[PDB]
Design a binder for these strands. Structure first.
Lengths: 135, 213, 62, 99, 22
RNA sequence: CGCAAGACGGACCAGAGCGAAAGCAUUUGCCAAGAAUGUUUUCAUUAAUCAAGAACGAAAGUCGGAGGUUCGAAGACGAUCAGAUACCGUCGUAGUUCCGACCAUAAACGAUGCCGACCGGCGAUGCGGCGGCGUUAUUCCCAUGACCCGCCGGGCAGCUUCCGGGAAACCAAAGUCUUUGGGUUCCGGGGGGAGUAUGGUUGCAAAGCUGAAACUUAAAGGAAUUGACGGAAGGGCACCACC
RNA sequence: CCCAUGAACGAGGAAUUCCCAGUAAGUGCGGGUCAUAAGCUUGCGUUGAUUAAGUCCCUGCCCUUUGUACACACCGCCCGU
């Protein structure tokens, strides 16, 4: 199982952190991104809908992902943190910071950090009306 | 209990010879199961490697996308597919009291690799300038764009893909563009913003192995 | 869980929702060159020494 | 009665200004009347800087920043306290607060 | 009553009168 | 990792530009147009404003055709609620996009007609021209760009001022007004009834233009002041507040 | 007042009084009412703390700026079926 390399040198995966304001995704994949190692979402670690975007759920997801990756021989991660993008918000959700902190806390090495939020040159109409979300 | 990672093999991905650091990492593929072939599913895989991970020195905000078209001996041999600037880098240059001039060209190398190249430049505030804004007039912007397109076409269409990547590594194209346009409007942060392979010639193993080693 | 020394040199102010803590500047005796900020709980005298688990902690800063 | 000489916008010398949607409520507000903030933020929070820096594979990685432009309508900008009401004389002061 | 809603009410009244008055 | 479609043109982007207004932002090309500036060019009063008449005129809306990503009146469902028929959520029709005809209305606003003269100061900014130490690029002369310092002419604005005005707010015009007359167009005459009725006219329609009266009423309204209150913001205080 | 009567209470949910130095707190005597009368109140002594020398939370007090169509002053004013 895992790679056949010396233990001193790191094996790099890529961690996509899709932190929205509803819940957070921690998704480790191959360097190419085509093959995935583990994906733990904040909604898989809490029972309340309101808590799926909480920092605690993201921390639990990051610990699960880190343990699974260590079980598979990946020791270092490139981070690709994104917000919802498109019409919607361009800022990362509440869980992104806790997810990154818990990834680094469990002994996982961190490589390049990138913001891959989808940004439109310009987009379709945004979901709200011309008066917006009024409540 | 079936673990789907017990049937997956780890291959080492190798960069083309234009970069000092040869290996870029490991990629896992499900072993050959019946008709499905591990090799042909391993092909067409794009790795976005930062330049500082491909050359010992040099900047890290330039990333190269390399595509795997062959796998031999548990090694995936990649090739140039595209190039970009990191999101933070490109966001950091767009300031609010200057003109940003963008050009793009679809130009073919001598090997038949049609590339779309996007160049970006910014007008530079002079060291003794009191005026807050460094805007270029519309004809000046058009002249700068013409110069950028002409230089990009000259640098790509005359030579082959290997030397195109060799000169993209230090972004010499942007440096000569900036030196050329210093006379129309002094430019500030000139980079070939992005490169994509629109169309590539039919695969042959000889050229791929030549680009390696 | 390394433990080092820290002694108060400047009482920066009082923090907390209801005046719980003191944001105070503390120097490490073993280094006598670093000043860090701590929301120390309790009556603090300027010059007291306390053994701490933490050597890099910071709190809400203004 | 007129509260502001510029009517609370920058539309001088043109008829129409294209609208943009508020990032907080998706309200259509003119690009000149919208209240614009440009945040530069460390993608790693101050508490998490130590952990990520210690766990880095490189030396002196200098972490990337995040550049977000937020456009607010007047209601959302007031509720979020980005801007606030001022006295009739302090209203005319366009000088940004120190930073 | 909002002026535009009174205008809409008057428009509806005129339409109803046009329908009834054939 | 690819392919397709239909929208849109971020950041740069500004109290910046252009346009009669509505309005206008990817590259490049073609097409005709335009302001300002420069002018020891030309005509020589050809001008200003404008009943009638005419061109354009956001969005929504109508008819026909194409398209249909997103959003989305109507509608369906889920919530919140005493109730909600609404706000909020999931969908979603017409529509939103384009082509050809219609409509001609907006807080179409600078709530401020156009043309001309005169009456303070200052720093900017956009275009054109003129002048000038010095700094940069064209890797060489001049020139030409990018800066720097001024001047002149239109332009968008800003600050300031016991010009003057105004009920004041405030306005270098909303000044040069009982010391009242530069020219000219539209238009108001207490609040409602009411932009309603009716007639005419336009439109396929929705409706647009024109537009009363009976009757009712002592105020309606403008600006500013002091309080009171605010499900507005920021402070301060008491162990009848907290820690 | 003398005999017998040991029910309930194992320091007790949410909301929650009151307390900084001879104070809280424990403790008895006195004045008020008063046939001689205190589980209440008003004084007094006696014994007698770690309580923190801070902040405004969620408590009131409305000080400044701000909006107002309120001034009988929001228990206001007011629209329509």
């Amino acid at each position: 199982l895992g790679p056949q390399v010396a233990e001193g040198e790191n094996v790099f995966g890529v961690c996509h952190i899709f932190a929205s304001f509803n819940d957070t995704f921690v998704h480790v994949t191959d360097l190419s991104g085509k093959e995935t190692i583990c994906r733990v979402t904040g909604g898989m670690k809490v029972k309340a809908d309101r808590d799926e975007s909480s920092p605690y759920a993201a921390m639990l997801a990051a610990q699960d992902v880190a343990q699974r990756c260590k079980e598979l021989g990946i020791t270092a991660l490139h981070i690709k943190l994104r917000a919802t993008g498109g019409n919607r918000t361009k800022t990362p959700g509440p869980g992104a910071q806790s997810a990154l902190r818990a990834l680094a806390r469990s002994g996982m090495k961190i490589g390049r950090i990138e913001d891959v939020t989808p940004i439109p040159s310009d987009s379709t109409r945004r979901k709200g009306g011309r008066r917006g979300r009024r409540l | 209990v079936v673990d789907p990672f017990s049937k997956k093999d780890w291959y080492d991905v190798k960069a083309p010879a234009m970069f000092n650091i040869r290996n870029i990492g490991k990629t896992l593929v499900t072993r050959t199961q019946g008709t499905k072939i591990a090799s042909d599913g391993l092909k067409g895989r794009v790795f976005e490697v930062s330049l500082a991970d491909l050359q010992n020195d040099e900047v890290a905000f330039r990333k190269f996308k390399l595509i795997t078209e062959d796998v031999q001996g548990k090694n995936c041999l990649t090739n140039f597919h595209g190039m970009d600037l990191t999101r933070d880098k490109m966001c950091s240059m767009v300031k609010k009291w200057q003109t940003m001039i963008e050009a793009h060209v679809d130009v073919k190398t001598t090997d038949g690799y049609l590339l779309r190249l996007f160049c970006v430049g910014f007008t530079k505030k002079r060291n003794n300038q009191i005026r807050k804004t460094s805007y270029a007039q519309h004809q000046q912007v058009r002249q700068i764009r013409k110069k950028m397109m002409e230089i990009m076409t000259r640098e790509v269409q005359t030579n082959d893909l290997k030397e195109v990547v060799n000169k993209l590594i230090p972004d010499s194209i942007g440096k000569d563009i900036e030196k050329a346009c210093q006379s129309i409007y002094p430019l500030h942060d000139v980079f070939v913003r992005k490169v994509k392979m629109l169309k590539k010639p039919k695969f042959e193993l000889g050229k791929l192995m030549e680009l390696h080693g | 869980q390394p433990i080092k020394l820290a002694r108060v040199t400047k009482v920066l102010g009082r923090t907390g929702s209801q005046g719980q803590c003191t944001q105070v500047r503390v120097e490490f005796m073993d280094d006598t060159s670093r000043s860090i900020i701590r929301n120390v709980k309790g009556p603090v005298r300027e010059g007291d020494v306390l053994t701490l688990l933490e050597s890099e902690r910071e709190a809400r800063r203004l | 009665t007129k509260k502001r000489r510029n009517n609370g916008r920058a539309k001088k010398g043109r008829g129409h200004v294209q609208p943009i949607r508020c990032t907080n409520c998706a309200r259509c507000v003119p690009k000149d009347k919208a209240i614009k903030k440009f945040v530069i933020r460390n993608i790693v929070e101050a508490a998490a800087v130590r952990d990520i820096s210690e766990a880095s594979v490189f030396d002196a990685y200098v972490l990337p920043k995040l550049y977000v432009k937020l456009h607010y309508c007047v209601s959302c900008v007031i509720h979020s306290k980005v801007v606030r009401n001022r006295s009739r004389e302090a209203r005319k002061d366009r000088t940004p607060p120190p930073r | 009553m909002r002026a535009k809603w009174r205008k809409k009410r008057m428009r509806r009244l005129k339409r109803k009168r046009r329908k009834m008055r054939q």
